[PDB]
Amino acid sequence: KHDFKKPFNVDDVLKFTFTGEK
Amino acid sequence: VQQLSLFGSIGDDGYDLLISTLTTISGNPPLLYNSLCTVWKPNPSYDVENVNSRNQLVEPNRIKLSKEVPFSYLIDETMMDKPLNFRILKSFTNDKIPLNYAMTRNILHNESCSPWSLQISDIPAAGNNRSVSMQTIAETIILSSAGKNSSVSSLMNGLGYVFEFQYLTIGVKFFMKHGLILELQKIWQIEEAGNSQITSGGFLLKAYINVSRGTDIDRINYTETALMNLKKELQGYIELSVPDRQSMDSRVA
Amino acid sequence: MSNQALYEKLEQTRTILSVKLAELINMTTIADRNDDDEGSFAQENSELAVATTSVMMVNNQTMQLIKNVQDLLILTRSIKEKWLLNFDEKQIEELLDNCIETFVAEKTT
Amino acid sequence: NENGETDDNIETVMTQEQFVKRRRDMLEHINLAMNESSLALEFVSLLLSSVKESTGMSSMSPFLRKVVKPSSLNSDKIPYVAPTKKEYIELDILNKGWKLQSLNESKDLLRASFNKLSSILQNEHDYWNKIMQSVIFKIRDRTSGQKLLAIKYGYEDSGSTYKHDRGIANIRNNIESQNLDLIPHGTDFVHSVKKFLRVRIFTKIESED
Amino acid sequence: PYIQERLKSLNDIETQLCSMLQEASQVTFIFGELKRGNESVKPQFENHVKQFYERLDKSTTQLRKEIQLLDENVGTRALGQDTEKMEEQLDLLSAILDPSKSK
Amino acid sequence: IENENKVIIELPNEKFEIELLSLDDDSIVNHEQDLPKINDKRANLMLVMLRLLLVVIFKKTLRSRISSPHGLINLNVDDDILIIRPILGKVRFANYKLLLKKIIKDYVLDIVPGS
Question: Using CA atoms, how far apart are residues F72 and F81, in angstroms rounded to an integer?
Fold first, then answer.
């Protein structure tokens, strides 16, 4: 015994919800 | 109303876990819910100044009509059946429920209309570094309608607005301490040329509290704290942050 | 995290490995091993201090060996702990309640 | 197992006279060697011959009052030879095998009571098995707020609210049984004294007698 | 739960360690006879000796392995309110059924 | 009675039903023999009801909680919510029943016509 040692853009999602910018 | 909030996200991968966790933190189960939002803009044919009879600088903004769709108008398969929302969301990923959502905008399936949540929001509070997103919302409830053109679409046109875009959201929400709500959600763009999931890949995470005051700096400051505590408690598991203001401005754009 | 916790255990194991060997090897030196060969580099000269090596070996090696053991049994049971950290449904019932009510409450019809 | 090994590593004991006399033994028998290491500090004054020697010297208050630099030696490198070369020195190296042997005899003895000491710990292995057989509320008490005493367990009321004094708190005894604390309702392994709700209905008739 | 298995694997590794002790203890008393010139059990000395090495190497792999497993388990993925609230009924209701008719 | 003990009891046939002192409920120490009695059988029905009835309370509490923002905390304002337990059972037994019986004698005052 011997040895050694995101799914998407949050901001843009929101941008869409508010303006319909996708 | 004042809506203080923090945002973030998880891939569908993280959902299962996050759920088990969120249930323990809050001590309530997640509860399945959904809602459609229809956005309207001022009729681009009309044209108006930005001032009142009380000389006030007033900007054109979009209106947001929101309400629940009973799941009967939303769901693809009974076989899946069941009551569980997270395992069910995988079923929903990438693509649409029946939708064609136009139908409901003008009744169908000789008619009056439903209740709506009619809202208009302002850009979140200007702030050099905010610990939390603080946003003002003007709302009224429409109860039902009457008159010749009583479809919600006729009503909006009568008021001088035009339909702009729309989206469905389905998720689970957690009811929590001091009015704190957590929504784990998915969003779908609804157009006539088909539906696509805006949140494809995962879930939009929103932790928030609507406050009645605004003018009680204390309850406002208490609310900041609540949200902070949450982000903090989950820190090293998920960061809740303030969204870019610019990205929450429903103005003309 | 878990990693850092284990590192300690590995070190303890290495310690436990290196001391029954010193008890064995130092046994040779303790028993006294004066060499006709000049090259051999272990010493046991002076009275008190060369048999004192025997008294120190006892306490040192034997408690380091047994200690590596005590610490390693702690290590074991620590991980154990870590792991132990972790009807008549229907209106049918409406009927049942009516039954109890008439039962408990009086009058004979 | 770890807790029990930690218990043996807490010095802990409730002994009268037994515990008392033993610790007095430590005091005196340790003190002796402390005091004899002070003869070792007196060899320090024995240097004298240098200022740094005086520094070492003041080690005794009696050196503070025994001014002299006092002692002197000569050469018996011959006597070093005699120490090393004597048949006596060859023989003395036998005192090395001899003490070392008896040390190995001690070592053997210590080693065996060790496996039997691990055997009382198998009582615990069994207790853990008992616990393996058969709320993850995590608590800390005795105040402080950091360290002190910290542990975990379940309780009762949950959804909907009675209000006062409602919960449960749970810990393991050396008899491999769990004691149920309540954070009041005062501990008695699976309770001490219990009140069920009970009921009782009387009728006073006598045919109106 | 089925982890009670992994728990017992470690509690046994614990008994393995108390054997590292028990075995090397003989190594102590047996090397006692050996340097005493009485080469009597020199083969038996060698036996219990490579045996103390063997027990601790097995323990060393076994708890090292267990730690690897726990890291792997870690890599792998109020309750009070829930069941209790409903279950209230289930017991009292079933018992109210029981006192109404039986046997 | 006395603020030191409370006894549950009701007028008709003078009867009493259940008990537990303002000090407490059921504390264990007695000899054990088996004989039953008609009162005893009825009495087991009471306990389960009274017990049950506050699972109801334990439930309509949680209705409000799950349902709306604030939470439910602080228990039985107007002793409207509170009163349900042990209040409506007492009422139920006694009142409607005795009164119905009494109404029926009054309807015997209309006992006159063939009717």
Answer: 12
3-class DSSP state for residue D193? coil
Query: How many angstroms away from the CA of D130 is the closest CA of chain E?
Result: 11
Q: To the nearest whole angstrom, how far is the Cα of C54 from the nearest Cα of chain E?
A: 14
Q: Beta strands B2-11 and F15-19: pairing type?
A: unpaired
In angstroms, the CA E63 to CA A3 distance is: 17
- What residues contact residue B236 under an 8 Å CB cut-off, 6+ apart? none
Is the Cα torsion angle F89, F91, F94, F97 positive or negative in sign? negative
Q: Could you tell me which chain F residue has the CA closest to the CA of E94? A: F48
CA distances B189 to B68, B118, D162, Å, are 16, 19, 47
Spatial separation of the C-alpha atoms in residues C89 and B7, rounded to whole Å: 42
- Backbone φ and ψ of B183, nearest 5°: -110, 130
Contacts of E95 in chain F (CB under 8 A): 48
What residues contact F72, with CB distance under 8 A and at least 6 apart? D160, D161, F61, F62, F64, F65
| Contact criterion met (CB below 8 Å) for D151 and D139 | yes
Q: To one decimal place, what's the resolution in Å?
A: 15.3
Of C104, C106, C107, the CB nearest to F49: C104
d(CA B210, CA B225): 14
Residue F85: how many other CB atoms lie within 10 Å: 18
